[PDB]
Subunit: 322 residues, 4 copies
Amino acid sequence: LIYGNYLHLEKVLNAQELQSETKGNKIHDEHLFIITHQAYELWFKQILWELDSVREIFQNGHVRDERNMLKVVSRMHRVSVILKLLVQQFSILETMTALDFNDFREYLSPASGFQSLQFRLLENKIGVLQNMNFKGEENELLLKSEQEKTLLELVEAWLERTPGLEPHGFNFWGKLEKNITRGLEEEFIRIQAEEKEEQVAEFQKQKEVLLSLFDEKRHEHLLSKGERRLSYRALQGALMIYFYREEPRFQVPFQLLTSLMDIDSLMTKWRYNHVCMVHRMLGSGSSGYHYLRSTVSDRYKVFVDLFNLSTYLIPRHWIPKM
Amino acid sequence: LIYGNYLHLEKVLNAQELQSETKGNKIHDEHLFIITHQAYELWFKQILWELDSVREIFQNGHVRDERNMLKVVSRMHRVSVILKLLVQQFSILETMTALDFNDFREYLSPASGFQSLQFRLLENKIGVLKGEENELLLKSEQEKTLLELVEAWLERTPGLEPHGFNFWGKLEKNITRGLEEEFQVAEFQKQKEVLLSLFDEKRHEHLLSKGERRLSYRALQGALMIYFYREEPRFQVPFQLLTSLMDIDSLMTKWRYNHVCMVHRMLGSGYHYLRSTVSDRYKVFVDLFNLSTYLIPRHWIPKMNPTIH
Amino acid sequence: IYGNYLHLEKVLNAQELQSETKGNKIHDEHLFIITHQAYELWFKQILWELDSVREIFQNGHVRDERNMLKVVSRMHRVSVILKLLVQQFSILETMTALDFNDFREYLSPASGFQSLQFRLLENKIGVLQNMRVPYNRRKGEENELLLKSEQEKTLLELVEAWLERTPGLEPHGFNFWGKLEKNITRGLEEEFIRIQAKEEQVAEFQKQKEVLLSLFDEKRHEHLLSKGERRLSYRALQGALMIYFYREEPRFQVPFQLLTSLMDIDSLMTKWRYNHVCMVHRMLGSSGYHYLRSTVSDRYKVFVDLFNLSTYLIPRHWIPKMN
Amino acid sequence: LIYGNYLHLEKVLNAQELQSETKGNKIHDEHLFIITHQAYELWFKQILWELDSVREIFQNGHVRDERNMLKVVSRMHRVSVILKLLVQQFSILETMTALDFNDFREYLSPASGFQSLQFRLLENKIGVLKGEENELLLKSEQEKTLLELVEAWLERTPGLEPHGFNFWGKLEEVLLSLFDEKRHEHLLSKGERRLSYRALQGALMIYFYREEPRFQVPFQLLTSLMDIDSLMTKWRYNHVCMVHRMLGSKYHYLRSTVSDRYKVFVDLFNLSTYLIPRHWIPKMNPTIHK
Ligand code: HEM
Ligand code: HEM
Ligand code: HEM
Ligand code: HEM
Ligand SMILES: OC1(c2cc(Cl)cc3[nH]ncc23)CCCCC1
Ligand SMILES: OC1(c2cc(Cl)cc3[nH]ncc23)CCCCC1
Ligand SMILES: OC1(c2cc(Cl)cc3[nH]ncc23)CCCCC1
Ligand SMILES: OC1(c2cc(Cl)cc3[nH]ncc23)CCCCC1
Ligand SMILES: N[C@@H](Cc1c[nH]c2ccccc12)C(=O)O
Ligand SMILES: N[C@@H](Cc1c[nH]c2ccccc12)C(=O)O
Ligand SMILES: N[C@@H](Cc1c[nH]c2ccccc12)C(=O)O
């Protein structure tokens, strides 16, 4: 068995066809444009392989066995490490001037980054909302990616099964509501001296944000608008994991929720470096840099609710005692 | 024209075949081992594409027109930026455990990184000391390496002519002078030998005979002229050039060094040969790195008069 | 010596956990402090390069071309430092939101707006005060150090005083400006007769034509200048293009490198701003966070002008051939 | 309470005194040499802070309460992330040339990196084989070190109990030499290995059964510790490369610090040379891993 055939280099190293050269005008730099894209595409392929396997571990019910938690977390972690490398690859393409790009730009229409299947599958499989062309079996794979359970949904189901939520067990939700309410009364009774009412106003801010956690109708309204993604119950699971992270059963789960936020951030870091590049090369649906600039928002953060949990931080003493 | 077709994705994204799976025991991590390789190989091809283009500009006489020096330097820079990323790219494969590698290791046999054609071309084309692919490989040994092209170009540096600036004559004079000026006998007597030893062609012509040096003597003087008068406008960009060349060398060693760590993390203690590639033995531009041990006080540097610009 | 040379008796006695001095030591506060100290140590150094580069422009002896190697290589060093500053945020990412919240209270009134060095850094590069987005909605001899910094010459101002004097712009010399507008007309007229031989590139042509010729609109330039969009004088804009188009010309090689650095700085600063705000979001949720997302706009890019050059890329065979 | 006060910047940003002004002529590039050094020393301090508190959780015995494993692994990992930055950090000082260095090198002598307290503190607390700086050096030579603490912990690893799970046992060609306990203690007597015989099998158990819930975060601690070792080496190698970029060849000793002899956690490294087919690993029964 030969290194070359094992790696299928007869394919990989035979895939660089310069359009400029095909049209009787080799432009040196077009070869960088191709290589850079094909390397990202191999890594998208690998992200999909990691990400699909973790999806099966939840689909399966195999996550129901903690033994498998180390597999899920270190493949999530592996996605991050790849995504990080992806962000740093931009540095290679910055060694291309706009003037070198402008010599070959024309040979490129009407191709677009939107024709990237794997990028779309990736967004879909993670759980990018969809309300926010392709043919044949590519179009199949895409519909499978829009219809199969997403990593977001699979995680939401696992969150919804967190130990601690049982109102006849630990009763987390119920005591958290009770301790926050007692907490605030304490803070109100204290605050009674009189130009520090900065403190009264800062109190009234704290109270609105903390007691809003307990407003399920609010959350539903927010879900149907798209501004939150996890079901209310999922949210109670994720807070339980955050608040009781040191407990052994919650340690590796807490790492997972941390990875999920890493992947999201890093997806954003990607998008933001794509937008800076576009701006370097070209200046200023699609408008068309303006559509991209648009994708750098929280609207593309699949794990938005995990980030926002940090808004419902409380003094340590108010956390129900386990 | 479609993204996927333009990038020949029907080849790139159809090249992953898990030997373990083919052999009826699919192991998850093998896919990472293939992709990582395949991505290193893409960039080797890029590095080779930049290198050959640069090689050609020397071989071509195009370097003689200073208009071209920016294309040389910016391409060389680019190779170094790739290599930097190639170095960072090991961190992906470190997410694979010895224990996991072990599960598909056996299916790899007897394949070897020695059978990477491109890595080997790379070394040859820079300069470092099987079917039809032999054609490419033999070609890359016969043909002028980057070391040689840079050497030719160094030999022709402005400022060495004995009836022009006479740089080497003036350097020697200033050096034997500075020395007897102040003149712990062991501090002086053992900074003497290395300094004036810059002028004994003989230790030079000798060291070139046991691989210790690579550039020729005139090549040396050129490099030093550039080193010393780097600020004079016509030396600006060529100084950058020598910097990139050194950068290429370092980072090539960095790659070799991290591959060595990988091997150790997977296989423990082939391996012992790889460690020896982390040597100066594999530094194509040793002579340029050592053009720092010949730092002198700025007073001893021969003064520019109304030269050329 | 090593110790005293580095003033380590000072560097390594600057760590005071405000939490601990309230009898409630929070392990993580110490990381929060060290991380800032290292950023500020590197601001001091960006300021040393930047000020020295500022000085080579001021000392007159920039138009002695022998110094360009200095200007350019210290600018590149600014760049490598900020690259490291961007990677440095990953250290502080290992601190969780829960743990930040066990020390955060001991921090008020302190605010990071009170980084002298960061305000100095923005100012010497040339971000302007009328350019700033107000927080909500608005010192000492530190005001006197800062006070100079906005009134003195900004790196932008000083680079612009170098671009004005770019060779090839004398109307009786090479006349780059003149020759450029004349050649575009003819490429455009030639192209117009090409298309006339749906598509629906009649639309595409007209958009190309308006964009290109508005470069020669000195009026429309000063409209956008006096507003805030553009930052360089029409004549500085003119020499920068010279350098872009003729950059292979020996005397323009290193200057084009200059122009590349200045763009890297603004890119790298924005990247810094953007990581600092990613960091606010994970510690604080989703307000200071609003204003920060505001600084990551192009309003804060001091060399927005050079980036904009890319829209006024023309076909190669239209750049005035030079004898 | 104010930013600069809180950060003690009047002290931090007033340590920059270059021996170029105070001897003749301000050479610009010395400023970088000092700030790089100062930044490494700040991170060294931070590394000492995390590394000390991890030590303390082991001495305390707080480690036996598994609640705290997250805090241990997470702080070891932060050490890693810090070390990775300190490796990327050399990239700043490679923007100074040999030539500009030589112009101020004269005036540094005879300061030495051998004189860095924190470096030697950090090397000793991890457990790598003078003014009252030496009261702090001495404790660090005698205070129980992260390698020992971990060894202590490794001794108590479940599934070792000679009548319990009795992991040592076995099959049925470099693997039988794991079982020569004299041969092993003779390596340790020379110091080509560092953990005690029992501590050795704590680790192989954690290795071989890493999936088992109570072993997961411990498998991360071991992985983390290897990492800190690789990162320290890689720092040494980059530090050696600097030296050669500046002073050229003919230094010979620093090469020798880039060896295995300076891997504190060599045992961990080679405990993944012991690699058997999955079919051979001993099976599992009633599990005391919650
Ligand atoms: C010269 C460098 C590049 C330029 C000027 C550039 C330009 C653009 C532009 C203008 C768009 C907007 C969509 C459109 O109008 O077609 C876009 C989208 C895209 N580009 Fe690039 N691009 C570059 C490099 C890359 C690279 C290296 C990748 C990596 C695979 C990439 C992947 C994409 C993807 C996936 C999209 C669609 C993304 C989305 O939905 O947000 N591009 N690109
Ligand atoms: C999975 C971890 C890896 C292990 C255990 C490993 C192991 C080895 C070993 C033992 C050798 C030398 C002897 C031989 O080939 O039989 C070698 C050589 C080589 N490997 Fe790897 N390797 C790994 C990953 C990589 C990667 C990612 C690349 C990137 C292309 C690579 C490229 C090479 C090359 C080019 C050679 C020949 C290099 C030379 O002559 O210095 N290997 N590998
Ligand atoms: C725990 C991590 C951090 C948090 C939560 C944080 C928080 C904030 C917030 C909320 C602001 C907005 C203004 C305000 O309300 O005070 C701000 C501004 C600032 N922060 Fe941070 N910060 C963090 C880390 C850093 C770091 C590591 C630095 C590095 C020196 C830094 C330097 C600054 C500076 C200079 C500003 C002013 C920036 C501007 O005016 O746009 N911060 N910070
Ligand atoms: C121009 C760059 C530098 C050069 C030429 C250099 C040179 C050296 C040399 C020659 C030695 C060994 C002999 C001796 O100290 O007399 C050494 C040791 C050392 N240097 Fe540096 N150094 C540089 C930068 C740095 C930096 C940035 C640090 C980080 C704090 C540093 C920290 C050390 C330490 C901690 C040691 C002793 C540790 C050991 O035995 O491995 N040096 N240096
Ligand atoms: O032709 C473009 C392109 C072409 C190809 Cl093949 C891949 C791309 N990734 N991102 C952009 C892109 C580059 C110019 C802007 C429109 C799309
Ligand atoms: O089979 C090995 C190998 C196989 C292949 Cl396909 C590529 C490789 N790069 N580096 C090593 C290497 C990996 C295990 C050690 C023997 C060589
Ligand atoms: O107290 C804050 C702060 C305090 C200090 Cl000391 C440094 C800071 N950098 N960025 C923010 C920041 C941190 C939380 C929000 C208000 C400002
Ligand atoms: O003065 C020297 C030095 C001085 C100082 Cl201050 C810090 C150093 N780190 N590494 C080396 C070193 C630099 C040259 C080699 C001897 C020590
Ligand atoms: N893995 C188990 C238990 C579980 C669910 N969610 C969790 C969250 C944290 C800890 C454990 C769990 C399950 O799938 O039902
Ligand atoms: N470019 C000219 C002059 C030259 C040769 N070597 C150089 C080195 C540095 C500067 C110029 C040169 C040539 O190739 O003959
Ligand atoms: N925490 C317990 C049990 C223990 C020791 N080492 C371990 C390794 C893995 C799992 C548990 C342990 C103790 O320190 O005695």
